Every structure is written in C-alpha cells, then in structure tokens.
C-alpha cells in the first residue's frame, strides 16, 4: 500500500540514520585541531606564464603528468595544448562542436579528451604518427551536456555528463563499460583519486556522490553542500576531496567519514565556485570563484591564503600539476594564468 | 639539444598562432546564436526555416556575407542552469516562444520564467535576446475560438491595451494584435526590469509568414552589435 510514500519514508529514515551516524563520529571537526599547525600567510602568487591563444571563453583545462603540457577548452572549437615551460601551443585541435566544457589529459600524454553540449566525448590522439591531431575515439552515449571527464588511462575514462549519470567509457571499444547512475541533478565535475580505483563526482544537487570505478556503483553520497557543485578535486592523500559549489562555500569531504570536515566560507565572497584543485600537499585548496579571482583556501584553517588578480572574467577552470609545481587558472577571457 | 627541439617547438607554436589568428577572423565573423525554447515551443519550425537546415545540435547560415552559428539545444536535458552558462560569449539568444500555448500547463509563463532567468543571469546579462513569438499562425484564431484565453493565465490582460507604437498585421482582428502585443510587453517588462543597458530584448513575431526568417535574425543581430558598440563607446 502506497509504495511511493512508504519508500520515501524508508528513504527519509535511512537518511536520518546516516546523519546520526555521521554526527556520532563527529565529536570534533577539522577546525578543532587548528592550534596544532602554523598558518600559511597571504601568499599572493604571480602570473609566471600567461597563455593567450584562445578566441572564445575558456571553460575547461587539465594538466599532464609531466607537469609541462597542459590542455584547455574554449567555445571557439579549439583545444589548445599549451607548453607551460616555454609558453608554446603544442597543438590546436579543431573541435567538432564549438561549445565544450571538459578537458582531460592522459596520464601518459598520448591522448586527450573533449566534449560539451554535443553530449559526445571527443578523444584525440597526441603522439600519433599521422602528424597532426585527429579524433582517436568518439564516445557518444550521453543524453546531457558532457560536463567534465578524467583520464584514468589510454584505455578507459569516465565522463560526467548532464544526464544525471556518469559513465566509465572505453577508448579501445567505444562504449560505456559501466554507468554511474544515482545523481539526482546533472553532474558538473568529477575527479580521480591518486589510487585511480574510485572516483567522486560533484553534481548540481549539492551531493557529490562517491563512485567505484571497478564495481560501477555509488560508494558514498556526500550531501553536505547547499548548491550546484560545479567543481571537485580528490585530496592528494586519496581519502578526501574538496567541492566547489554555487553557494560560495567550499567543503572538504572525507571518504572514511562520509561527511564534511571543513567548510571554506567567507562573507566577502558571495559568488559560487566553479574551480577546485589541490596542491602537491593538499594544504592549499585552489578555488576559482566567479568574482574573477581564484581564492587559495587553506585546507586546515578555512581561510584564503590570498586571492588571485589578473583574470577579469569568471574562472571556470583551474588545476595544479601532479607535483604541485604550478597552478594554471583559465577564465572566460580566453586567457590562462599559470600561478606559482 | 640547445636549440634543436626548442626551435622546433617555437616554430610549431608560431604555426599554431598563425592558424589561430586566421580562425579569429571567422570566429568574429560567425556571430554565435543560442536557439532555445520552453519545450516544443516551435523551435523545430525555426530550424526548418533557417537556410534549409548529430541531429538538432547546431545550424549555420550566412546572409550579406555575415555567417552565423545558431546552436540548437533540442537534444539536451530540461535542467538548464549549467549548459546555458556556456552561452556567455554568444551574440544573440534567439528565444523561440510559443506565443499561443498559454493555455497548454501554461507554457507562456514557463517561457516568461525562462526569459527572466536568462535576463537576470550572471553571465547572460550582457547578451540580448531575439524573442521569436512563434506559433502566430495559431494565435490568429486562438483568441477568437475561446479554447485558449489570456485571462485564464494572465490577469493583466484586462488592464492592457494595444500600444500606440504597435504595428498590426494587415487583416488581423484587434483582439489578436492585442494578445500578441500583450505577450510582447509581458516579456519586455522583465526585459527592461534589469536596468543595466548592456542587453535589450528584440521581440519578433514568427511562424505567421513563411518568408526568410534568418533575415529577421540578421536585422536583429545588426542592431544588437550596434547597441553593444554604442554602450562600449557610452553612446547608448
């Protein structure tokens, strides 16, 4: 009798039990041990290398494992693969669709990812023997805007689309090996853990659901946010991750706690976050807000270590190298400022 | 070596920059356009009547040597708080509104709310909207047949009359023109409620005449860039 209402009541009581279990292990918080570590100070990073090669606004970027070649996406249909060490554009990939929202550099540097409102993840070969770049694989199985994607390897990647479901693709075959379904809102970003075994994806339902790339199911669901989680990044330790949403507050969730540990909020900044990345140590939380400035939040004291000047438009993409050497923040002014 | 791979990378960057400067000309030439609606609001008839043109994702047309990039969104999902932000550098947001579906759900109020969210947006606030009051061929008789009345979903119709600057169609009942201009002014109310001066609505009436519809888009985008440059030079 009344399967809908009864199942909704069981879901409500399960959520209440989960919240009670979270609060039971929440005797303290991340700010309760704030007196054990020294602060970091206002470290105002400067633009070491500027990248001005795009024609339209830059929506996505991604770093490589070599920490030298970075990729960036813009609505002009160009996927510029920059060289951060010498300020050189290695490739200018002519994209099939103009509007693109994702970027994913392969861990080996041979592949790269694309995609946007076309609902198609365009994989391009970089180290191919054919000279210029070309479409290495056409992942077309999503019904929503392909928001973000991450490169696990040259064989299989996972893309966060706008159809409320993510999917672990396969560059060898071209089909979704497993679909990550369960997000109530359209997914906006995903990030791979350093162990590459499990990933978390932040959607527009204030719930960054943690998935398992192996089993294809949702491990945990982190409902600590308030607005559309536009950005996400897994802590370099592999057991935690930060989230940037539209509520102007960043939150650092932990997989082993299933709840938020620190909420990076500030009354001076009311605009939402669409860029979140961690340094080599994870102490600095690079957070690209919508106020044309990226806030370097301290992941242990909940205080920005200095906003970033330069960009005059919304910074929708920001990423730190695999060794934390430099962070390249690209905004909607077709520019990429690499901070250090 | 010392200058072997570095010079190769520099010349590759130079070739890429040359290609990018060549593509910037056509990028500034192809004024991107956003074609959307409140759901089956007659946008398919607009894609059909646009240069006679991977399904409904993007169509391109060129008039007076001015090419355009009309990106249709007839294949995305209903939630539009993220993909609509990708149209921040877009030139014109062609809003195809079903002007006769006010009774059918109240699709007219849905289109009004969509236009309000597009206008007061944080990124779409600097972009005008080519309001295409589609389905006028049905509105020609929708108000007389009584099957779809404005007062059933808009009480301001009784307090509204045809404006003095109205341009009625030859052979139209005054009630039809009154309802059409009421929808136009109801859109323009929330259009001008922003008070920023960076974007203004371009209300047109389509689906009534089967002539070149992209000519209206051309004449609208012309004035769009006109007013954009005027605001840039503080002339308007």
């Amino acid at each position, epitope marked *: 009798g009344s399967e809908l209402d009864q199942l909704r009541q069981e879901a409500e009581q399960l959520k209440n039990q989960i919240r009670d279990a979270r609060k039971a292990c929440a005797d303290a918080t991340l700010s309760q041990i704030t007196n054990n570590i020294d602060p970091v100070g206002r470290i105002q990073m400067r633009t070491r290398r500027t990248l001005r090669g795009h024609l339209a606004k830059i929506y996505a970027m991604h770093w490589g494992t070599d920490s030298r070649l970075l990729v960036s996406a813009s609505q002009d249909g160009k996927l510029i693969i920059w060289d951060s060490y010498t300020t050189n554009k290695v490739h200018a990939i002519p994209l099939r669709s103009s509007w693109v929202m994702t970027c994913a550099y392969a861990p080996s540097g041979n592949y790269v990812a694309c995609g946007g409102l076309d609902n198609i993840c365009s994989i391009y070969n970089l180290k191919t023997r054919e000279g210029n770049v070309r479409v290495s694989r056409e992942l077309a199985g999503h019904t929503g805007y392909l928001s973000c994607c991450r490169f696990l390897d040259d064989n299989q990647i996972v893309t966060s689309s706008g159809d409320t479901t993510c999917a672990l693709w396969d560059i060898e075959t071209g089909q979704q090996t497993t679909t990550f379904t369960g997000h109530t809102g359209d997914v906006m970003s995903l990030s791979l853990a350093p162990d590459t075994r499990l990933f978390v994806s932040g959607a527009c339902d204030a719930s960054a659901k943690l998935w398992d790339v192996r089993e294809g199911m949702c491990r945990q669901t982190f409902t600590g946010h308030e607005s559309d989680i536009n950005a996400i990044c897994f802590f370099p330790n592999g057991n935690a991750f930060a989230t940037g949403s*539209d509520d102007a507050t960043c939150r650092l969730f932990d997989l082993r706690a299933d709840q938020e540990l620190m909420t990076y909020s500030h009354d001076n900044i009311i605009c939402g976050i669409t860029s979140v990345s961690f340094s080599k140590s994870g102490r600095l939380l690079l957070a690209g807000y919508d106020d044309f400035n990226c806030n370097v939040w301290d992941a242990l004291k909940a205080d920005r270590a200095g906003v970033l000047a330069g960009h005059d438009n919304r910074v929708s993409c920001l990423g730190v190298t695999d060794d934390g050497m430099a962070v390249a923040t690209g905004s909607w002014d077709s520019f990429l400022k690499i901070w250090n | 070596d010392q200058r072997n791979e570095e010079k190769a990378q520099r010349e590759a960057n130079k070739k890429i920059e040359k290609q990018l400067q060549k593509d910037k000309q056509v990028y500034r030439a192809t004024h991107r356009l956003l074609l959307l609606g409140a759901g089956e609001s007659g946008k398919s008839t607009i894609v059909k009547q646009m240069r006679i043109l991977t399904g409904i994702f993007e169509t391109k047309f060129q008039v007076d040597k001015v090419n355009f990039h009309m990106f249709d969104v007839g294949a995305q999902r209903d939630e539009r708080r993220k993909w609509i932000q990708c149209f921040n550098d877009v030139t014109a947001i062609i809003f195809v509104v079903a002007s006769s579906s006010y009774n059918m759900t109240n699709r007219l109020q849905e289109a009004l709310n969509l236009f309000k*969210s597009i*206008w007061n947006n944080r990124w779409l606030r600097t972009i005008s909207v080519i309001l295409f009051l589609n389905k006028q061929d049905l509105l020609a008789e929708k108000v007389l047949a009584g099957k779809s009345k404005i007062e059933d979903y808009f009480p301001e119709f009784a307090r509204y009359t045809t404006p003095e600057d109205a341009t009625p169609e030859p052979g139209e009942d005054p009630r039809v023109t009154r309802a059409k201009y009421f929808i136009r002014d109801e859109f323009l109310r929330i259009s001008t409620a922003s008070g920023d001066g960076r974007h203004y609505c371009y209300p047109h009436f389509t689906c009534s005449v089967d002539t070149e519809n992209i000519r209206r888009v051309f004449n609208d985008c012309r004035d769009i860039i006109q007013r954009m440059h005027l605001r840039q030079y503080e002339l308007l």
Partner: nanobody, 128 residues
Framework: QVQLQESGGGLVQPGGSLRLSCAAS????????MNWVRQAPGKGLEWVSD????????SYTGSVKGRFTISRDNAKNTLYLQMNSLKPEDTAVYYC?????????????????????RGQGTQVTVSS
C-alpha cells in the same frame, strides 16, 4: 542535505483558503530566491509564485496572481504560500523548488521532474 518539507495542504473546498508551510532546512534560507511550483495530474511542472532573498521581488503566475500570496520567513527558514480564493484548476502537487544559485535573480527551477532543490510535494486538491 537540501531538504524541503511542505506541511499543510490536503483537500479543501474550491474558493476557500489554504496555507503551505515549506520547511527549508539544510541551507541559508535567507540567501536563496525560493519559489513555488505545482504539478497537476497529467500536466507538467508549472511555476506558481516566487519571492526574493529578502522578500521584495514577489511575483506569481497568472493563474494565481492576486489569489495566492507568498511570504518567506528568514528567521524560521520556511516558505509560506497563502492560497486564497482557490479554483478547480488548483488540483496539483505543489513543490517548493528553490533557486540553486544564491544572491542571483535567476534560476531554472521550473524544469521537469527529478529536480534537485525541489520540495517533496504536497497534494493540494480541491473538491467538486
């Protein structure tokens, strides 16, 4: 968790009065442009009312303009929809769809089902 529980509603007489108490917990209620949407049996989700972050930009749809009355309570973190002079077309499940982006006058919460920051749904019905 962004949860919205709409108390009240039920089955009343057409033309009477009704008040919905939407419990807005899990977010800063005084910073989101909370609004009201309904879903009639067989009809899609249509926007009903709206109120600003502080209560200035108050707007309703044409079907409830003048009849309904919205009032946000930033102290109690709840959204009220005072329904007056109901109509037979008010047979719908009223949802508490919230503006996702705070400090903004824009949101697309008039979307179809499976919306994130929407109420759980109260069955507001009228007799005949």
């Amino acid at each position: 968790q962004v949860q919205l529980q709409e108390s009240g509603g039920g089955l009343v007489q057409p033309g009477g009065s009704l008040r919905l108490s939407c419990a807005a917990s899990g977010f800063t209620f005084s910073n989101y442009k909370m609004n009201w949407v309904r879903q009639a049996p067989g009809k899609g989700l249509e926007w009903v009312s709206d109120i600003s972050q502080s209560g200035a930009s108050i707007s309703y749809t044409g079907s409830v303009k003048g009849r309904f009355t919205i009032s946000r309570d930033n102290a109690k973190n709840t959204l009220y929809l005072q329904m007056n002079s109901l109509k037979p077309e008010d047979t719908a499940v009223y949802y508490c769809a919230r503006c996702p982006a705070p400090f903004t006058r824009d949101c697309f919460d008039v979307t179809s089902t499976t919306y994130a920051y929407r109420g759980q749904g109260t069955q507001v019905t009228v007799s005949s």
